[PDB]
mmCIF file of C-alpha atoms and ligand atoms in Angstrom:
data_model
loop_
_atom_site.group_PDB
_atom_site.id
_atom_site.type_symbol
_atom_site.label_atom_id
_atom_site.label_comp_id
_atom_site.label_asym_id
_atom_site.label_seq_id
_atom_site.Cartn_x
_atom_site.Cartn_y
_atom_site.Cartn_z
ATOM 1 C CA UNK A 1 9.105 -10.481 1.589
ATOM 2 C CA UNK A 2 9.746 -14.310 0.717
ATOM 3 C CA UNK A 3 11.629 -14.039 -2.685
ATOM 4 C CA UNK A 4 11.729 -10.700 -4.654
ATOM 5 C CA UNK A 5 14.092 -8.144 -5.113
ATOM 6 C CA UNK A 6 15.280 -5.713 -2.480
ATOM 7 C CA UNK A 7 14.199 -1.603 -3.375
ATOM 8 C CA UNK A 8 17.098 0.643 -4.930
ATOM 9 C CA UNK A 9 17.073 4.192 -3.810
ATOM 10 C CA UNK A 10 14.037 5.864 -4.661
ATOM 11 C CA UNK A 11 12.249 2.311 -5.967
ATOM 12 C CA UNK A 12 10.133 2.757 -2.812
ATOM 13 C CA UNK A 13 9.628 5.831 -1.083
ATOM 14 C CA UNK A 14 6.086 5.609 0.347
ATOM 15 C CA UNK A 15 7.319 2.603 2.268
ATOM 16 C CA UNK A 16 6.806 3.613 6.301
ATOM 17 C CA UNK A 17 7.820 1.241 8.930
ATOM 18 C CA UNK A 18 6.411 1.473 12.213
ATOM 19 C CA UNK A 19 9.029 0.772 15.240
ATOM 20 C CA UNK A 20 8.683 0.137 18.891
ATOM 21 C CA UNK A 21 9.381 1.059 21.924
ATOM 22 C CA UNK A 22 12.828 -0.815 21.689
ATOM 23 C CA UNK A 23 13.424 0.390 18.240
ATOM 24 C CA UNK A 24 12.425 -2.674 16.654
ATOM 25 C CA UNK A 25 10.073 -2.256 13.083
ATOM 26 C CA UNK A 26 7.221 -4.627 13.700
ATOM 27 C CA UNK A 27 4.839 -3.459 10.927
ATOM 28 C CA UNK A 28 5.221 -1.659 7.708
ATOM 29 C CA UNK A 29 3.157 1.056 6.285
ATOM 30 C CA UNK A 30 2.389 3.293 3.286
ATOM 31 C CA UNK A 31 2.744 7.357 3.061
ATOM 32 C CA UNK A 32 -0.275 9.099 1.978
ATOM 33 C CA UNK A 33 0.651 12.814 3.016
ATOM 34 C CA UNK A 34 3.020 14.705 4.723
ATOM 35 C CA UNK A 35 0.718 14.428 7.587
ATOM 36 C CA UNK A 36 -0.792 11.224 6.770
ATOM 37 C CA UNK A 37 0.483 7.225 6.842
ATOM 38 C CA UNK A 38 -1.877 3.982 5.787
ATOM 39 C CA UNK A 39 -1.492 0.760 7.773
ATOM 40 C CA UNK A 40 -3.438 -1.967 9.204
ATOM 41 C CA UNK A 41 -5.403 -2.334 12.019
ATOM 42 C CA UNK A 42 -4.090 -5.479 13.499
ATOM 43 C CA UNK A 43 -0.733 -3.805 13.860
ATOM 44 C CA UNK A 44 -2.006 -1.375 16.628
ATOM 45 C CA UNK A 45 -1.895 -3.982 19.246
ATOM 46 C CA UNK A 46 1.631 -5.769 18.831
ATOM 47 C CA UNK A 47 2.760 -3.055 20.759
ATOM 48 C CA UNK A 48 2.394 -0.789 23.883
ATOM 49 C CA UNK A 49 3.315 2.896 22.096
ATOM 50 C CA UNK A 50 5.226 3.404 18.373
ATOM 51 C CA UNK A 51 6.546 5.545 15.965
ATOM 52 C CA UNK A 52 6.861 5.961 12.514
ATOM 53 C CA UNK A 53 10.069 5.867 10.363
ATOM 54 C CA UNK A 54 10.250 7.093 6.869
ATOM 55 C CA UNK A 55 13.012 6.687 4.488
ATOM 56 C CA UNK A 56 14.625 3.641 5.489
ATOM 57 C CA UNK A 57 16.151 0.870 3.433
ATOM 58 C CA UNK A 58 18.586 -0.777 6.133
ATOM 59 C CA UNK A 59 17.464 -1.381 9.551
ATOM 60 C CA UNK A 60 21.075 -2.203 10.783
ATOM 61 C CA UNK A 61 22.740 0.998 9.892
ATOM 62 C CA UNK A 62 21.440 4.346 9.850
ATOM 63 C CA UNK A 63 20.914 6.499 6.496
ATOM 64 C CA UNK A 64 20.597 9.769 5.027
ATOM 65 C CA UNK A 65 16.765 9.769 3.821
ATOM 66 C CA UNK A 66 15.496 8.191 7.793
ATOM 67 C CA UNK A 67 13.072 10.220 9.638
ATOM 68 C CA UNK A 68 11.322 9.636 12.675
ATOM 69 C CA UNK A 69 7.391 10.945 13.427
ATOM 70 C CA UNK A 70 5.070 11.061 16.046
ATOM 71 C CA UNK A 71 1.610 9.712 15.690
ATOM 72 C CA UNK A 72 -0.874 12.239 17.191
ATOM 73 C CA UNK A 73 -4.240 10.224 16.404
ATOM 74 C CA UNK A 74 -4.588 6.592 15.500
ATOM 75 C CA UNK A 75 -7.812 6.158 13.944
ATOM 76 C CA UNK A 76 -8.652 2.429 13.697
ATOM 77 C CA UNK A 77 -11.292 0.759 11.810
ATOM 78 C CA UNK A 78 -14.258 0.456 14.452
ATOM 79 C CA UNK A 79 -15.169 -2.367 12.855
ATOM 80 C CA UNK A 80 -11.869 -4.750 12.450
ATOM 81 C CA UNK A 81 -11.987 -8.051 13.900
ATOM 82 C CA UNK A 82 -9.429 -10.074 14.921
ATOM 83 C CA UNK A 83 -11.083 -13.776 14.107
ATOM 84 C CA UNK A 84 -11.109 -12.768 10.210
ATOM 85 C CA UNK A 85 -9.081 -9.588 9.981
ATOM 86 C CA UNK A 86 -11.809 -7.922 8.273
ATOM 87 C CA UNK A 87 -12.014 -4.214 8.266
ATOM 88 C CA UNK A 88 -8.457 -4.565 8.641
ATOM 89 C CA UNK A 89 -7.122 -0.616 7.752
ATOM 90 C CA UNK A 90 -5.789 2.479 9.929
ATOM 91 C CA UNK A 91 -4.827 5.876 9.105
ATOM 92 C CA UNK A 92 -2.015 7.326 11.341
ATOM 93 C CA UNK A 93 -1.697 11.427 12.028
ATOM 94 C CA UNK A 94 1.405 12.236 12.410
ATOM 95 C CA UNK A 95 2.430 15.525 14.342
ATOM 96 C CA UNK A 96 4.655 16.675 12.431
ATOM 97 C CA UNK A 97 4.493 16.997 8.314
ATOM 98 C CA UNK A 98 6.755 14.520 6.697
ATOM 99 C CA UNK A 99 9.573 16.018 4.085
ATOM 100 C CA UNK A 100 9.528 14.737 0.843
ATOM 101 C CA UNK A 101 12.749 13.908 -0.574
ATOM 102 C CA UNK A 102 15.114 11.002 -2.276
ATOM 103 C CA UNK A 103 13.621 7.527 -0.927
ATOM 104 C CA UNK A 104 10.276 9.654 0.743
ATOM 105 C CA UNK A 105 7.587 10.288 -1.127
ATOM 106 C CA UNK A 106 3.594 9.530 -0.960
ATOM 107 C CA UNK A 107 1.579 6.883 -2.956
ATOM 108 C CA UNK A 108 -1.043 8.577 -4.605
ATOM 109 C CA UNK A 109 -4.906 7.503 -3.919
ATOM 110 C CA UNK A 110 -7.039 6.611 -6.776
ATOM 111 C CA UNK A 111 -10.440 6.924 -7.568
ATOM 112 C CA UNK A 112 -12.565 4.398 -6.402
ATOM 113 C CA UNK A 113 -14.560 3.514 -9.973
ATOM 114 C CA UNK A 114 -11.472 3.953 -11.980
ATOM 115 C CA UNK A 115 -9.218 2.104 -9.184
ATOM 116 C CA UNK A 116 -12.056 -0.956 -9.924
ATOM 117 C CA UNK A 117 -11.633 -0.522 -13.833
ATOM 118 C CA UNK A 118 -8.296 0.296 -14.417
ATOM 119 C CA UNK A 119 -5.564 -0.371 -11.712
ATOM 120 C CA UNK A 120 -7.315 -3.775 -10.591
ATOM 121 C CA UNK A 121 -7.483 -4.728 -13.576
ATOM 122 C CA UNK A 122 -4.052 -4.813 -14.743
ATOM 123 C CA UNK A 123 -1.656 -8.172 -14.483
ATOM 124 C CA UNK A 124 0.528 -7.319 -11.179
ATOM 125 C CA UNK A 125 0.878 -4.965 -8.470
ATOM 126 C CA UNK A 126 3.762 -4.602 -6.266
ATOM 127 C CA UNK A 127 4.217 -5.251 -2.509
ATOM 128 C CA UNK A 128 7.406 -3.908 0.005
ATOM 129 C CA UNK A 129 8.638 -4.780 3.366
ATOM 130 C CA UNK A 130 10.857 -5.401 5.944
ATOM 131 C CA UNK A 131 9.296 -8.589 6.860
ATOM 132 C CA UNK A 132 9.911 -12.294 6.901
ATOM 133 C CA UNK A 133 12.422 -13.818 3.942
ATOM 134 C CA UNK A 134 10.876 -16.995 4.926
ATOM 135 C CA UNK A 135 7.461 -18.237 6.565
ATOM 136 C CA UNK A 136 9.954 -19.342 9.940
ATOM 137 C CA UNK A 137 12.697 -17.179 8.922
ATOM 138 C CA UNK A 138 13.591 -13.901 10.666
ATOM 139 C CA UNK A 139 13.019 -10.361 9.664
ATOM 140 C CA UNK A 140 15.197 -8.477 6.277
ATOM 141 C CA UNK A 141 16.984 -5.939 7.407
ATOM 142 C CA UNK A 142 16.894 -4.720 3.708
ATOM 143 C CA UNK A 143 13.981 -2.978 2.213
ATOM 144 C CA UNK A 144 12.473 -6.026 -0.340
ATOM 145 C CA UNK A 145 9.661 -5.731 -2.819
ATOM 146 C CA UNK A 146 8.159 -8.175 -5.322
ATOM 147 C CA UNK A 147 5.877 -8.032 -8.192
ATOM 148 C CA UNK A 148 2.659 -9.561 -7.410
ATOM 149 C CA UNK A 149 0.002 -10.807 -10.383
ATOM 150 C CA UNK A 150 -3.604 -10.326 -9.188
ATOM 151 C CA UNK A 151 -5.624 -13.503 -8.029
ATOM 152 C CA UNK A 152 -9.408 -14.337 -9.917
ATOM 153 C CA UNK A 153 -11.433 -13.611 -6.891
ATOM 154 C CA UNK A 154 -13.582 -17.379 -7.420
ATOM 155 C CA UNK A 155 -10.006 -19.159 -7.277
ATOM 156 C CA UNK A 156 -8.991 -17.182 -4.371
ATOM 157 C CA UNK A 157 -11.814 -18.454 -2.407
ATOM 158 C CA UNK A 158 -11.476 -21.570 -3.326
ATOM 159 C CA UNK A 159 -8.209 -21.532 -2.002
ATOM 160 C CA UNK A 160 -8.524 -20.342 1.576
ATOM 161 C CA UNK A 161 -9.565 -22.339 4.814
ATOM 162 C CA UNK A 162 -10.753 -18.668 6.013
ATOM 163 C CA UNK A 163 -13.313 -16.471 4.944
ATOM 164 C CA UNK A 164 -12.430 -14.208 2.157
ATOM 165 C CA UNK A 165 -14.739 -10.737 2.737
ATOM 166 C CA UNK A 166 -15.633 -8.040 0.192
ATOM 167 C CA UNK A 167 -12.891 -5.908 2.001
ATOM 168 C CA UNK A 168 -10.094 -8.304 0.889
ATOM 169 C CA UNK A 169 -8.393 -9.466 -2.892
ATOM 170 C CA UNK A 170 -5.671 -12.029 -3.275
ATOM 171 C CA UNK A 171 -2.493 -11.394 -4.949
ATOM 172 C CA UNK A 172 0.511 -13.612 -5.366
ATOM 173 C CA UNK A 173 1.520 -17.047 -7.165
ATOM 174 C CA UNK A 174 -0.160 -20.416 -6.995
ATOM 175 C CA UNK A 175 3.278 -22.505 -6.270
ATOM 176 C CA UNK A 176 6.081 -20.289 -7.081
ATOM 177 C CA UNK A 177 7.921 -19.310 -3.794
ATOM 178 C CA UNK A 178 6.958 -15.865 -3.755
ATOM 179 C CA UNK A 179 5.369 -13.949 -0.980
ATOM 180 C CA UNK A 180 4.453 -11.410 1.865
ATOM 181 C CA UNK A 181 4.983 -12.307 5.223
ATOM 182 C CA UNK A 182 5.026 -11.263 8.768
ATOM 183 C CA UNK A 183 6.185 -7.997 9.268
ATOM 184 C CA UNK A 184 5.045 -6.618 6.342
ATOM 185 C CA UNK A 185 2.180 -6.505 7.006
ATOM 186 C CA UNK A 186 -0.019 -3.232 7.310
ATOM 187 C CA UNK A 187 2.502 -2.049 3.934
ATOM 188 C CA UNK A 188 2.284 -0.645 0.376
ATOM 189 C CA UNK A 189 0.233 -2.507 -2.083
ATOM 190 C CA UNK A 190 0.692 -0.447 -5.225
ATOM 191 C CA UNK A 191 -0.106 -0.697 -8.791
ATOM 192 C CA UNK A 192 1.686 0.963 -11.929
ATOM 193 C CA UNK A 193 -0.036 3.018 -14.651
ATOM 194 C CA UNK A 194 1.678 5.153 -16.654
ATOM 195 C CA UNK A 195 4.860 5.110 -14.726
ATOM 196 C CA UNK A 196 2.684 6.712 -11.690
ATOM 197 C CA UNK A 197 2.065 4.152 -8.286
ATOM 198 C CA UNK A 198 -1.117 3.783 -6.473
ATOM 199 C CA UNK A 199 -1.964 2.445 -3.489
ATOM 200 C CA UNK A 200 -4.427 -0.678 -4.073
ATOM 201 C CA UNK A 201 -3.797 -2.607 -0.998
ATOM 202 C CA UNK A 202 -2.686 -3.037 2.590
ATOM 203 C CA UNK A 203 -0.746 -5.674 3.861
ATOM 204 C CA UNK A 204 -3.081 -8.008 5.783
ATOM 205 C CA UNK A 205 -2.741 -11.604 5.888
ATOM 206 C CA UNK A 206 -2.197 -15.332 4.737
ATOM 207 C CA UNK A 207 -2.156 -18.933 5.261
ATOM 208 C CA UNK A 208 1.876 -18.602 6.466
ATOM 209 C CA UNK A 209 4.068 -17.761 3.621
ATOM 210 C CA UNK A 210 4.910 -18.733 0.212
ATOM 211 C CA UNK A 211 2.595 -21.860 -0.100
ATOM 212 C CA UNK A 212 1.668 -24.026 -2.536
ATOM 213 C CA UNK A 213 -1.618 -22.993 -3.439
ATOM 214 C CA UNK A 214 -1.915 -20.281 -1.320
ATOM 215 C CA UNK A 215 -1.719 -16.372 -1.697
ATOM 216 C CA UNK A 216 -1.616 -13.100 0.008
ATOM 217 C CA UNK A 217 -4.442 -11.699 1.545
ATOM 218 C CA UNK A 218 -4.785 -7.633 1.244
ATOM 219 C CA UNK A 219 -7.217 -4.969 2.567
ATOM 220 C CA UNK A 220 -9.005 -3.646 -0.378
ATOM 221 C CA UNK A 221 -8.273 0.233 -0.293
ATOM 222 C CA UNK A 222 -10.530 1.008 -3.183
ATOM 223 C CA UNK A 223 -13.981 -0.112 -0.659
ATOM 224 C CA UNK A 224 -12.184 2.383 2.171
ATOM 225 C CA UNK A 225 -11.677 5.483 -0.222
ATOM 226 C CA UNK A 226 -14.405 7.756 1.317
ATOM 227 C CA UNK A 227 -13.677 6.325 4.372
ATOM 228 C CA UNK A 228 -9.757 7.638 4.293
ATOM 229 C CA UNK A 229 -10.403 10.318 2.359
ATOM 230 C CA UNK A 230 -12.802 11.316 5.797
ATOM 231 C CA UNK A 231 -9.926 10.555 8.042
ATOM 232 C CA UNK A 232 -7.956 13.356 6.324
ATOM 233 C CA UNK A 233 -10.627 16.379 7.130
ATOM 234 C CA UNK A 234 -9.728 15.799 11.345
ATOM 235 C CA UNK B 43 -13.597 -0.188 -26.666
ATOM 236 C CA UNK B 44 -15.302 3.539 -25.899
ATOM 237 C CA UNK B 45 -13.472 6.567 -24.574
ATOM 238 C CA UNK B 46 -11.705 5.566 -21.012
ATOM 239 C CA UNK B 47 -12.166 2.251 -22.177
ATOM 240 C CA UNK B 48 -9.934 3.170 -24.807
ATOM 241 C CA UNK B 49 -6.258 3.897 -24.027
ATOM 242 C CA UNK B 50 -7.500 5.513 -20.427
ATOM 243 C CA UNK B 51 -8.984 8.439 -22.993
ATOM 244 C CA UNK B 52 -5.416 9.515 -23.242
ATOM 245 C CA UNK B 53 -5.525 10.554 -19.738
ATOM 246 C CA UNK B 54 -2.669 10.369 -17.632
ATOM 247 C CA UNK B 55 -4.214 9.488 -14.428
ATOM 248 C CA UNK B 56 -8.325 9.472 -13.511
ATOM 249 C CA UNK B 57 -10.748 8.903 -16.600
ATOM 250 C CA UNK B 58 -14.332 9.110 -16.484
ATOM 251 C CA UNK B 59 -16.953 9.761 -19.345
ATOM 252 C CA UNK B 60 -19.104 12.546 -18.855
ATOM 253 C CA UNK B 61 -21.315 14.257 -21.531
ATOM 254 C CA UNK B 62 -20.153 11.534 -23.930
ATOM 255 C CA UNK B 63 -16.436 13.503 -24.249
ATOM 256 C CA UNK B 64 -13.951 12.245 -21.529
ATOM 257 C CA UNK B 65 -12.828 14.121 -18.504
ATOM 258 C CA UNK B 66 -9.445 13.783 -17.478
ATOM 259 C CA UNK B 67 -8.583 14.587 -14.030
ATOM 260 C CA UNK B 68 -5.043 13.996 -11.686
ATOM 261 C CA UNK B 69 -4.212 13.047 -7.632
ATOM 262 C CA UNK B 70 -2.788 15.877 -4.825
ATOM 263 C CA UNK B 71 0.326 17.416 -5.864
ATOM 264 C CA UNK B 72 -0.535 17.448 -9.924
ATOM 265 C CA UNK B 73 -2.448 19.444 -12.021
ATOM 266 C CA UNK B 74 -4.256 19.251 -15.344
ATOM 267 C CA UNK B 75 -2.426 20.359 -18.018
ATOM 268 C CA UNK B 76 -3.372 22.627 -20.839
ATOM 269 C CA UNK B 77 -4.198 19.748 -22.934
ATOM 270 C CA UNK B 78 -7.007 18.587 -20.360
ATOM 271 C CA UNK B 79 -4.977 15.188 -20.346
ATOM 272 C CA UNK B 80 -1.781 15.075 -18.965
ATOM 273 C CA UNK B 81 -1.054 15.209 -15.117
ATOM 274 C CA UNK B 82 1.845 17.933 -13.757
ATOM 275 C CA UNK B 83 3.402 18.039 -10.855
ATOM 276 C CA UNK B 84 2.966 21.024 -8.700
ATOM 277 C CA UNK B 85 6.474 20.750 -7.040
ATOM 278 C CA UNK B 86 9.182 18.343 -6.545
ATOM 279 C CA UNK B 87 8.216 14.758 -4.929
ATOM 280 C CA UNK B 88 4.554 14.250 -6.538
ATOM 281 C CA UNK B 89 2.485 11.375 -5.750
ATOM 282 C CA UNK B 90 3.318 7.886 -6.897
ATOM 283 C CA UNK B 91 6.976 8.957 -8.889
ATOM 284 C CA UNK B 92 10.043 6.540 -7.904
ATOM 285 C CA UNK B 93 12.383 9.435 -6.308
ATOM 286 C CA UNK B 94 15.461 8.556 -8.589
ATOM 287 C CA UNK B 95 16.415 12.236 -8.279
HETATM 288 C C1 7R9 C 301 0.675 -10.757 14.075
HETATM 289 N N1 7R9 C 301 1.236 -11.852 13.268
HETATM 290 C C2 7R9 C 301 1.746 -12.897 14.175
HETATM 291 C C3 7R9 C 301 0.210 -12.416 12.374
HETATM 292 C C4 7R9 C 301 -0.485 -11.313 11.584
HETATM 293 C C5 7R9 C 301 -1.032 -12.039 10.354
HETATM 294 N N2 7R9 C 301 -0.147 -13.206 10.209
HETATM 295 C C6 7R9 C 301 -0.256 -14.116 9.243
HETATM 296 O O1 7R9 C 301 -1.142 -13.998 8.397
HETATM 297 C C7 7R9 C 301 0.733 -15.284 9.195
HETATM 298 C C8 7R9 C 301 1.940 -14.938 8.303
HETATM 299 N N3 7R9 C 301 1.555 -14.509 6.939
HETATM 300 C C9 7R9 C 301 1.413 -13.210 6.653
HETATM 301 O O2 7R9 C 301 1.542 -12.324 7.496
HETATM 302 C C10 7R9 C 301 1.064 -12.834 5.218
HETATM 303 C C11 7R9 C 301 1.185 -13.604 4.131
HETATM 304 C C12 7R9 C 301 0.809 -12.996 2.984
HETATM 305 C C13 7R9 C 301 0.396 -11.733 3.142
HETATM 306 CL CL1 7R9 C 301 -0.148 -10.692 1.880
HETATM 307 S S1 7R9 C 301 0.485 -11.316 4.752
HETATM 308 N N4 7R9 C 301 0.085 -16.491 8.660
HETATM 309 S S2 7R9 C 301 -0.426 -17.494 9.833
HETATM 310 O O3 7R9 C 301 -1.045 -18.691 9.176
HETATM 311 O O4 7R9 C 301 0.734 -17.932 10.670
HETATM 312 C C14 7R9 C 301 -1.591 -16.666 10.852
HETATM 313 C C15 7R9 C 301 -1.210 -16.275 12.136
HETATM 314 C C16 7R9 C 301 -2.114 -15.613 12.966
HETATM 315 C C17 7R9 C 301 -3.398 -15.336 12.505
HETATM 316 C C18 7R9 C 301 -3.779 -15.722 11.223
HETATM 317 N N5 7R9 C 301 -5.079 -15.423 10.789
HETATM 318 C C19 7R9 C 301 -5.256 -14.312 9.826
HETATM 319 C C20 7R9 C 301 -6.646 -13.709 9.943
HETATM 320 C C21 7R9 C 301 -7.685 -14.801 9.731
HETATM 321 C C22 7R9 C 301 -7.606 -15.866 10.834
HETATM 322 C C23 7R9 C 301 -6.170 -16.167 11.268
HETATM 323 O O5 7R9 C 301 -5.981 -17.076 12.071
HETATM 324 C C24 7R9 C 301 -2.877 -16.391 10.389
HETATM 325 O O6 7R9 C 301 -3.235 -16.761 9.122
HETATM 326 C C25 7R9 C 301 -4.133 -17.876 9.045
HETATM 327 F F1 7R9 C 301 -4.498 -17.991 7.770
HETATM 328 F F2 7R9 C 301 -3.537 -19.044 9.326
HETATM 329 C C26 7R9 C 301 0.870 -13.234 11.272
HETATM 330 CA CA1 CA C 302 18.603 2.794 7.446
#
């Protein structure tokens, strides 16, 4: 997260953070269930074999909410593509169920007609990470979030030197330095209403980080709803 | 505005119009209250609450 503010205990307890075989978090993610974590798809080759973390704010000391899981079945958007990062959303079984506690909790799922009405339609949403502080920069070892407005969809286009799909939204500022980046990606997207947090979007993409005229690029979760909501049956 | 279009139809959570009245409904780990509006949690940790306790 380029800018923002970093998450106070309990600020952000669906954040998940998926870690290699070295130990080292390489893409975030976004607790749906005890047995259930959202991420994106283009994180599931940056590595050879991973695990999921839960309850972490400081990745250079250790802390009393951290948990480690298993992933039992990665199911990956058949469609995702690589040259457009469309379809770009997983769902991650864990096998074991996750405990709920300070600094761990899930992000609830809307409904997909009053996700389009209500929560997309408000002024910002809010995006957490232990990515990039800057577009060269290295990796936070704090949990960061920031308060993201939502992008007119026409601007957003007209904005990007790649294709922006149905499966996609924009959030973020036109020239204010403030930003996703890599290594957050495949994490929370969440919008407020009534002091309850859903999940919107997924950490996906952008033109590096922070630029003028640019903005974030995030997997639509509200076009995916059925779809996820499937994934949670097997 | 019209019902959910109005204040959410004084739903906490999911609003949709059905039968002209509004229908109030709430995510995993709530449940309806008495009211028909308001969402409550069915344990500790619910969906989408900042864990400041
Ligand atoms: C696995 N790591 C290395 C990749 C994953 C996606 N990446 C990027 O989008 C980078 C850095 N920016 C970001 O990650 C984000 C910025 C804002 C949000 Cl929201 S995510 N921006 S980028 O400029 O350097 C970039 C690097 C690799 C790939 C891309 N993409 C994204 C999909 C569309 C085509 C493409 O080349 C790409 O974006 C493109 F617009 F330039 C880094
Ligand atoms: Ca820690």
């Amino acid at each position: 997260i380029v800018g923002g503010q970093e998450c106070k205990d309990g600020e952000c307890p669906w954040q998940a953070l998926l870690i290699n075989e070295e130990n080292e978090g390489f893409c975030g993610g976004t607790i749906l269930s005890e047995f259930y974590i959202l991420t994106a798809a283009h994180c599931l080759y940056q590595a050879k074999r991973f695990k999921v973390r839960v309850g972490d704010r400081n990745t250079e000391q250790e802390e009393g909410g951290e948990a480690v899981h298993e992933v039992e079945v990665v199911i990956k958007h058949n469609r995702f593509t690589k040259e457009t990062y469309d379809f770009d959303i997983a769902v991650l079984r864990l096998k074991t169920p996750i405990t709920f506690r300070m600094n761990v909790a899930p992000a609830c799922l809307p409904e997909r007609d009053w996700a389009e009405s209500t929560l997309m339609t408000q002024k910002t949403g809010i995006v957490s990470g232990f990515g990039r502080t800057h577009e060269k920069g290295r990796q936070s070892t704090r949990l960061k979030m920031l308060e993201v407005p939502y992008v007119d969809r026409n601007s957003c286009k007209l904005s990007s030197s790649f294709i922006i799909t149905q499966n996609m939204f924009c959030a973020g500022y036109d020239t204010k330095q403030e930003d996703a980046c890599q290594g957050d990606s495949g994490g929370p997207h969440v919008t407020r209403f009534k002091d309850t947090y859903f999940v919107t979007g997924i950490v996906s993409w952008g033109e590096g980080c922070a630029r003028k005229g640019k903005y974030g690029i995030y997997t639509k979760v509200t076009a995916f709803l059925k779809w996820i909501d499937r994934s949670m049956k097997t | 505005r019209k019902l959910c279009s109005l204040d959410n139809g004084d739903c906490d959570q999911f609003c949709h119009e059905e039968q002209n009245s509004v229908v109030c409904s709430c995510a995993r780990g709530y449940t309806l209250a008495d009211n028909g509006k308001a969402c409550i949690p069915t344990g500790p940790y619910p969906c989408g609450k900042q864990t400041l306790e």
